[PDB]
Design a protein around this ligand. Structure first.
Ligand SMILES: *[C@@H]1O[C@H](CO)[C@@H](O[C@@H]2O[C@H](CO)[C@@H](O)[C@H](O)[C@H]2NC(C)=O)[C@H](O)[C@H]1NC(C)=O
Ligand SMILES: OC[C@@H]1O[C@@H](O)[C@H](O)[C@H]1O
Ligand SMILES: OC[C@@H]1O[C@@H](O)[C@H](O)[C@H]1O
Ligand SMILES: OC[C@@H]1O[C@@H](O)[C@H](O)[C@H]1O
Length: 482
C-alpha cells in the first residue's frame, strides 16, 4: 500500500497526489513528472521503475546529459488531472517571462529511497507550481487533509513556501480563502517556538502556528533533513502534525477550533493547488518538495500514522550533490576558461567584481592571488564548496542579484547560501561546472568576461543560451599563487 492506498482505506481518498520521487499508489505506473532540457527545449517524462515503485532517475540522467534540465510538470497520480505546472503571475509577478514563476531545476534535490536514486523538487526564491482548475479538491468549508515530505533545512522567512488549497485567481481574496501547509521561519504572521522553521497552516492573510494570530508556543521548530508535514481542516477544526520523515511518529502541534477571527469559520476554500508560493503568488520563499497529496474528508490520526509509517518505510536518504573532478577542503586552485577564444583567461577578480582575466607566469603576485582560490567545505552544505580569495582571506565568491561578487563572510545564512556551489562534471566535458546550491538552475558562467550565476536561458542578458555549456565549464589547475 502507498500513502493514497492508506488514505483511501480510511475513507478520505487522495484527490491530488504529487511526487517526483515515487508512485503514491501501489498500482501507479504512469508519468510522475515531465522534463525539459535547455539543449533543444525538447521534453520527456519520468515514470516509476515498476508499478508503485521509485522514479527512473537514470532515464533523467540520460536525457539531461551535457545540458540543463527543468521540471515542467509534476503529474497528479490520482487520475483527477490536477497536474502542477509553471505558476502564473497573480497579486505578485514571478521573476520569469510575463510574470510567471521559475520552474525548478531537475537536479537540486537528489536522494535515494531505500537505496534507489531519485530527484526531489528543489525550489529557490521565485520558483513555483500551480493548478488553478483542479477537480475534487475541497471548496467552501469542506474538510480535507494533506501532507508533504519536505526538507527541514531548506527554507527561509519570505512568503511563502506552501503546498495546499488556494485561490483559483492567484490573488488574495481574503481570510479563509486558503488552507495549505507552510514550512519556513516567517514571523510576519504566526510563528512557533525557537528559531524555526515551523510547520504552519496558511489560511490566507495569516500563517497559523496555533489558535492565536502570531506567536503560539505549541508549535515547535522542526528542522529534520526530511520532514513529514501533515495538515487537515474541517468544520471549525484543523490540526498540524509533524515528524521526521525518516523515523518515528507524527506529533500533534495543534488540534482544535479555527482561529477566532473573522473569515476563518466557516472557511471559503477555492480548490486551487499551489506549491512553493503564496496564494497571491508571493514568490520569495524557498524549500524542497519530495512528495505530497491532498484529500477529500478529514483524515483520522490513525490514517495519518499509517501514512507516516509508509513514508518512513520509503527510507529517504540524502543523495550526492557532486559529480566530476571536485575538490578537497584547503586545496588552492585556479579555474581556467574553456570557451574557445578565451582559453587563456582565468576566474579572478578586481575588488568585489568576479571576472575572467588573462593570467600567466608574468602576472603580478597580486593578480596571481586574485586568480587563486582556497576551496573550503561548502558554507551552507558540507557536500559542496565555497571559494575563498587568496589575496583577500575571509571573503568568498557569492552571487548577489545573480552576479558573482567577492564579499566578506558575514556569518549569515543568506551569505552562506549565496556562497555555496556544487561541482558537476563539466557540461562541455572539460573540467567542472560549479552549480549554485541555493539556485540549482544557475551555474558559474562568464559573460563578456564577467562572472554570473547564470541559467541556460532566462530573463537576464547573461543567461544567454549562446555558448552556455562552454561558458560554464572550467578546468581545475594548480593555483597561480602556488
Ligand atoms: C529566520 O532564520 C534566520 C537564521 O537563523 C534568521 O537570520 C539572521 O538574520 C538576522 C536578520 O538579518 C541577522 O542579524 C543574523 O545575523 C542572521 N543569522 C543567521 C544565522 O543567518 C532570520 O532573521 C529569521 N527570520 C525571522 C523573520 O525571524
Ligand atoms: O496568508 C499568508 C499569505 O498572505 C497572502 O499575501 C498570500 O496569498 C498568503 O499565502
Ligand atoms: O543572487 C540572487 C540573490 O540576490 C540577492 O538579493 C541575494 O543575496 C541573492 O540570493
Ligand atoms: O565571457 C566572454 C564571452 O562573452 C560572451 O559573448 C559569451 O557568453 C562569452 O563566451
Amino acid at each position: 500500500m502507498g500513502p493514497c492506498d492508506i488514505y483511501e482505506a480510511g475513507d478520505t481518498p487522495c484527490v491530488a497526489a504529487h511526487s517526483t520521487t515515487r508512485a503514491l499508489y501501489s498500482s501507479f505506473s504512469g508519468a510522475l513528472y515531465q522534463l525539459q532540457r535547455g539543449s533543444d527545449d525538447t521534453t520527456t517524462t519520468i515514470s516509476p521503475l515498476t508499478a508503485g515503485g521509485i522514479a527512473d532517475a537514470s532515464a533523467q540522467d540520460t536525457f539531461c546529459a551535457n545540458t540543463t534540465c527543468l521540471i515542467t510538470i509534476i503529474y497528479d497520480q490520482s487520475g483527477n488531472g490536477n497536474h502542477l505546472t509553471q505558476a502564473p503571475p497573480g497579486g505578485f509577478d514571478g521573476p520569469d517571462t510575463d510574470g510567471y514563476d521559475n520552474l525548478a531545476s531537475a537536479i537540486g534535490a537528489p536522494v535515494t529511497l531505500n537505496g534507489q536514486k531519485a530527484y526531489g523538487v528543489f525550489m529557490s526564491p521565485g520558483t513555483g507550481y500551480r493548478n488553478n482548475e483542479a477537480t475534487g479538491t475541497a471548496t467552501g468549508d469542506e474538510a480535507e487533509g494533506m501532507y508533504a515530505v519536505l526538507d527541514g533545512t531548506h527554507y527561509n522567512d519570505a512568503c511563502c513556501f506552501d503546498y495546499g488549497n488556494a485561490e483559483t485567481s492567484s490573488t488574495d481574496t481574503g481570510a479563509g480563502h486558503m488552507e495549505a501547509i507552510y514550512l519556513g521561519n516567517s514571523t510576519t504572521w504566526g510563528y512557533g517556538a525557537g528559531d524555526g522553521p515551523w510547520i504552519m497552516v496558511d489560511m490566507e492573510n495569516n500563517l497559523f502556528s496555533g489558535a492565536d494570530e502570531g506567536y503560539n508556543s505549541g508549535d515547535p521548530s522542526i528542522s529534520y533533513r526530511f520532514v513529514t508535514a501533515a495538515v487537515k481542516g474541517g468544520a471549525d477544526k484543523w490540526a498540524i502534525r509533524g515528524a521526521n520523515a525518516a523515523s518515528g511518529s507524527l506529533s500533534t502541534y495543534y488540534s482544535g477550533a479555527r482561529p477566532d477571527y473573522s473569515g476563518y469559520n466557516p472557511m471559503s476554500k477555492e480548490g486551487a493547488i499551489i506549491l512553493g508560493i503564496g496564494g497571491d503568488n508571493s514568490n520569495g520563499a524557498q524549500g524542497t518538495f519530495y512528495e505530497g497529496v491532498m484529500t477529500s474528508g478529514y483524515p483520522s490520526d490513525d490514517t495519518e500514522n499509517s501514512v507516516q509509517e509508509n513514508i518512513v518505510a520509503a527510507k529517504y536518504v540524502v543523495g550526492s550533490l557532486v559529480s566530476g573532478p571536485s575538490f578537497t577542503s584547503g586545496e588552492v586552485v585556479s579555474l581556467r576558461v574553456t570557451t574557445p577564444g578565451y582559453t587563456t583567461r582565468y576566474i579572478a577578480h578586481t575588488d568585489t567584481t568576479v571576472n575572467t582575466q588573462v593570467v600567466d607566469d608574468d602576472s603580478s603576485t597580486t593578480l596571481k592571488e586574485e586568480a587563486s582560490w582556497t576551496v573550503v567545505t561548502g558554507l551552507a552544505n558540507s557536500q559542496c564548496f565555497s571559494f575563498e580569495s587568496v589575496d583577500t582571506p575571509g571573503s568568498y565568491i557569492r552571487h548577489y542579484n545573480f552576479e558573482l561578487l567577492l564579499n566578506a563572510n558575514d556569518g549569515t545564512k543568506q551569505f552562506h547560501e549565496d556562497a555555496t556551489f556544487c561541482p558537476q562534471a563539466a557540461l562541455n566535458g572539460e573540467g567542472t561546472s560549479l552549480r549554485s546550491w541555493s539556485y540549482p538552475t544557475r551555474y558559474f558562467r562568464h559573460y563578456e568576461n564577467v562572472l554570473y550565476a547564470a541559467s541556460n536561458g532566462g530573463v537576464q542578458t547573461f543567461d544567454s543560451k549562446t555558448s552556455f555549456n562552454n561558458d560554464v565549464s572550467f578546468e581545475i589547475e594548480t593555483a597561480f599563487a602556488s
